[PDB]
Structure formats: C-alpha cells, structure tokens
Amino acid sequence: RCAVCGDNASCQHYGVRTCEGCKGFFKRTVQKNAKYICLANKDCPVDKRRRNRCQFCRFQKCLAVGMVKEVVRTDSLKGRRGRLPS
Amino acid sequence: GRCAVCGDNASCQHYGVRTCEGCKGFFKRTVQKNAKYICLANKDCPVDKRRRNRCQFCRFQKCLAVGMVKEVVRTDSLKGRRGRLP
DNA sequence: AGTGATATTTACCTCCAAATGCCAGG
DNA sequence: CCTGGCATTTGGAGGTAAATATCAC
Ligand SMILES: [Zn+2]
Ligand SMILES: [Zn+2]
Ligand SMILES: [Zn+2]
Ligand SMILES: [Zn+2]
C-alpha cells in the first residue's frame, strides 16, 4: 500500500500513505538537505526490493506521489513531536 | 430498577446515590430553594414509584436517609457550572 | 551509513458519568 | 407551579494518527 515501494503501509506520512522505510528515508533526505545522483537514465524502477538501489530515483518518487517537504519539522518545531495544536 | 429512594429505574449515581431522574430533580430543586417541607402525618410515609409525590417531606427525608449530599448542588459561585469539575 | 523497525510523544475523537438547565403536562 | 423527561456541558479514561528520536543490523 506504500505509494512508493508497494510495501506494507499503516498510516499517512507527510501527506501520503507510505511505508516505514520510505518515511525514514524522506525525513533524513529533507533534514540534511542531501543531494543524490542517478547513475542511470535519471529514471530507475523503484519497488519493494529495489528501493535501495538508486537513492535519487527513490526521492524523485517521494515528490511525485506528493510527500510534503514542509511537514518535516524545523525552525522552532525542531524536535517537537506528536500532533500539532489546531 | 435501582433507585435507592423510590425503586424505579436508575441511570447512574446522583449526589452520591444511584437514584432516579425524578429523585434527582426533586433533591436538586429543593436544595436550590432551601424550601422547608411539612408532613401532615407520622413522618413515616411510604415511598415508591406510584406514591413518591404524596408527601414531599418524607420523600426528602428518605433522600438524606440513603446518603444524598447537599454539598454537591452548586450554589454561590458554581451557579450553572455544568459537567464535571477539574 | 544509511536503513528500517521500534518506542515516545503529542492532541484530538468517541464514550461515558454526572453536573446544569429548559419546557410539556398534571 | 411542581414533576421528570430530555437537552446541553464538562473532563478523564482509552484508542488512534502521525510527528519524533533510538537504536540493532
Ligand atoms: Zn515504501
Ligand atoms: Zn536512478
Ligand atoms: Zn426515585
Ligand atoms: Zn409524610
């Protein structure tokens, strides 16, 4: 059900039904503002087993499915956990 | 039911006792007004669903007799404060 | 190193008890 | 005007969603 691997998902993460591996991958990439390189055509297949093959095409898929970078906490919300008051 | 006072169906505890909806209002409206009741007879009058309105004094007498509390009725400041308290 | 599972943290959402009030009838 | 059935509030137990940090491999 994970919108990127097809692996098992149990809840929405950053606005998309995602697995627990992509959730952790998306956060670290956005938190460290990391940059990747696709050694291939700039498009690599991403499924459960090959998700850890081209990190670039993986993150390219996280955006294409709509994971919002700004949900990854920062500023005076750095290290704040749980639901937000609203 | 379970009403300690008259024996009708009892929904939950009221002022310390598992009481009626009728005995709830009768106790509340009295302590609100602080009205004094008179029993024209022995001070022993029967109490059940069909005959609870016959003697007001005895109905209130039985209310204190089964442990209903005057302190729980809200007056002074909590006049109207609804629901449970912090 | 990253990866991914796991635990900690938050704040709503629904019951649910028990307080108040407000009328439709007797 | 007295009765009592119904409605409107409070807040705490208990569960859920979705942020985080914390590791073992
Ligand atoms: Zn996934
Ligand atoms: Zn690629
Ligand atoms: Zn009763
Ligand atoms: Zn009497």
The SS3 assignment for B9 reads: coil
Does any strand C atom come closer than 7 Å to the Cβ of A44? no
Domain harbouring B4, CATH code:
3.30.50.10
Structure tokens at B77: 């400041």
Neighbours of ion ligand 3 (CB under 5 A): B 3, 5-6, 8, 20, 23
Nearest bound ligand to the CA of residue B60? 4
How many CA atoms, within 13 angstroms, populate the side-chain half-sphere of residue A60? 15
Question: Can you give B25-58 as a three-state secondary structure string?
Answer: HHHHHHHHHCCCCCCCCCCCCCCCHHHCCCCHHH
How many CA atoms, within 13 angstroms, populate the side-chain half-sphere of residue A85? 2
Residue identified by tokens 């909590």 is B78
Number of structural domains (chain A) is 1
Q: B59 is in which domain, residue-wise?
A: 1-86
Per DSSP, the residues of A29-40 read HHHTT-----SS
The SS3 assignment for A25 reads: helix
Within a 10 A sphere around the Cβ of A23, how many other Cβ atoms? 19
Way it was determined: X-ray
Burial of B21 (0-12, 13-18, 19+ CB in 10 A): middle
CA-nearest of B69, B66, B50 to B8 is B50
Burial B34-69 (b: 16+ CB within 10 A, else e): eeeeebeeeeebebeeeebeebbebbbbbbeeeebe
Contact B17, B24 (CB under 8 A): no
Query: Which nucleotides of strand D are protein-proximal, with an atom < 7 A from a CB?
Result: 2-6, 8-12, 17-22
**Residue A9 DSSP symbol:** -
Ligand 3 centroid to residue B34 C-alpha, Å: 20
Burial of B29 (0-12, 13-18, 19+ CB in 10 A): exposed
Ligand 3 centroid to residue B55 C-alpha, Å: 13
* Residues of chain B (19-38) having a beta carbon less than 7 angstroms from strand C: 24-25, 28, 32
